[PDB]
Design a protein around this ligand. Structure first.
Ligand SMILES: [Cl-]
Ligand SMILES: [Cl-]
Ligand SMILES: [Cl-]
Ligand SMILES: [Cl-]
Ligand code: NA
Ligand code: NA
Ligand code: NA
Ligand code: NA
Ligand code: NA
Ligand code: NA
Ligand code: NA
Ligand code: NA
Lengths: 208, 208, 208, 208
């Protein structure tokens, strides 16, 4: 129930929610691999975060690039315990977020499978970020959700699919109110840590 | 979490729930603008409520009249913090209540937008009153609601639409039993104040 | 919140749940009018229950007979405060229970209307008994209910219809398990009293 | 039971007990109208007391002047809740104090009548000041009073006369010892406030 010692791969880690999650986790004793595009500024950020953080240049929509990134993570920290998908947050449906997430989940599951189970039998934790569907003034049922639905709808199924390997799968979705109060990373990061530390949360979607 | 110092525009403020809401708010330290038709008796009521209350002669279904009323409110109290729609409570569907409410919401949002956010980031609060659909002896699902549905169904959508400006939108609906016990304004007024003082209530419909 | 002093008309009062309800209410200080068919044994039972109980010979499916019964109740105890429908508990749909209940409700509402409201504004209380639909081995949704549905489905609508007169309408339905444990009136009677003493219960169906 | 929000008309408000009462009431959250002769210095005092105080130039013995003063009070603060007679404190019997008081009471009663009753049903409060009859060395019964008697003797009768309108009438009289201790406004002002805040005091004379 502690992130200390865990190795986390964070897509879109050079900035935004990804960077905020990395800073939080590293500050809590974990190791982080910032997986992001070359020239994204991930190299500088990984450097600033200390020797418990490395930069893995890669495009999340590329299976081969993600394999190289996971190999780097294993080469530098020994293994992969957690994957946090924060990248990208054709065009609207199969966007970078959905494609990168599915690509990461399919590849990291095999890696996490090699890990030895813990007390509760968990080998890994995967945390996804739902894609936001901008409010367009719709009325009725559609108004009750702020996410596209692709990643959210796949959460329970994927959690059930990886249960035998002891891999928990959770998704963080947006709330209905932008909470912009004008025109929060910390909150998102704290939720990531909380999900990682509670072995009882699995196959669920939590709105921030 | 206090209505003291707030400026509230109340449609249908010359009598009924509107007047009761004005008396309550003014008695609690807020300023009120009674927006009602000329010769509605709003001038006399505004006078009796004290120098923290003014009368804005206007027809809520008229955009130009409401603009004049909001300008008067800004000219007399400096700004508009709250809007309470109590007016009217073609014919049945697009009634005075629904049309006046939509007209007020569309216009006051821009005004409230100019306000500086508060601690929680709120710039304004809009409270609506659902139209009552008189019980006709229907059985089945229709028997479970006492409101027409137009304003009620638009509550969450409008709350989501104005979230970026920090404007909360809430609606007060009738209960299933007339609570007439024969053939309450105070209760309604107290609920208005409670909604204004609780920054956590947004996009919801509360039955009285 | 006390049945003491109240006058209750109980259909099917010569035996079964009706008699059990009468004994309980009279034992608690209320007055009861046993409304049942001539030669039902209601005359003897009314006699045995004491001077706070009278027998009103009548067929509940007959409007004229029920009018005579209510007139007797007013002539003997002054008024009608409560009506409990326990009679009959063409053929299957429009059975004695449903027809007697609707006939009693339509007639007693006018009588209860003449009563002066109480603290909470109530003039009367009407309690119905759902008709039992014998279990036939059905699977699926139909297995989740033990009542025919006619009286049960009319409960909320009738409660809303009589709200202005201050008359509460409640219905007692059977549970899914006969609770026969072999091949309870007291429980039913205690529930009747509890419904009468709680002014907050209205338009609801309670399974025994 | 609070003077906050109340509008008080105070005769002889430019100085003495009148001014002291105004300062006290305004300091406590009420609004005050200083009713006094032109060039009495009431204009300057009203100015210094803030925007919750105005000066109504008028001679209390003139009905028309008092009407103009009450109209000003309604025009500036919306209504008249309290009247405090402190003016003048032919010649000895029908002095300015007695004549001004009767004139004010007769006129303000009608104004206070238009107010909506409060919890206890009060629409207004009128407080009078007895005229002092200077001690002349008399012995016997006459030595037991320090007031002329006109206003004091009319207190209960006037209180009974205005009871139906919900207007309380009280009078403050001098004590037998000048309490001069040499050759108190604050005390008098505090008593005025206390009378206004206690709805149980009516038709009585209280010696200071
Ligand atoms: Cl999604
Ligand atoms: Cl509505
Ligand atoms: Cl039924
Ligand atoms: Cl006197
Ligand atoms: Na990022
Ligand atoms: Na590839
Ligand atoms: Na109104
Ligand atoms: Na217009
Ligand atoms: Na029976
Ligand atoms: Na008949
Ligand atoms: Na004076
Ligand atoms: Na005159």
């Amino acid at each position: 129930r502690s992130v200390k010692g865990l190795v986390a791969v964070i897509t879109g880690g050079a900035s935004g929610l990804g960077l905020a999650t990395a800073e939080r986790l590293v500050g809590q004793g974990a190791s982080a691999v910032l997986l992001d595009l070359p020239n994204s500024g991930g190299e500088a950020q990984a450097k600033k975060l200390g020797n418990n953080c490395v930069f893995a240049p890669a495009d999340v929509t590329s299976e081969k690039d993600v394999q190289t990134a996971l190999a780097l993570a294993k080469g530098k920290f020994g293994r992969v315990d957690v994957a946090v998908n924060c990248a990208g947050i054709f065009q609207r449906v199969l966007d970078v977020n959905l494609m990168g997430t599915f690509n990461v989940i399919r590849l990291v599951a095999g890696e996490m499978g090699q890990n030895e189970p813990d007390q509760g039998g968990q080998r890994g934790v995967i945390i996804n970020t739902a894609s936001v569907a901008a409010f367009e003034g719709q009325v009725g049922q559609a108004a009750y959700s702020a996410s596209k639905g692709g990643i959210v709808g796949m959460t329970l199924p994927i959690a059930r699919d990886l249960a035998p390997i002891g891999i928990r799968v959770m998704t963080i979705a947006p709330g209905l109110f932008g909470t912009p109060l004008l025109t929060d990373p910390a909150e998102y990061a704290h939720l990531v840590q909380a999900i990682i530390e509670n072995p009882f949360l699995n196959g669920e979607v939590i709105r921030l």
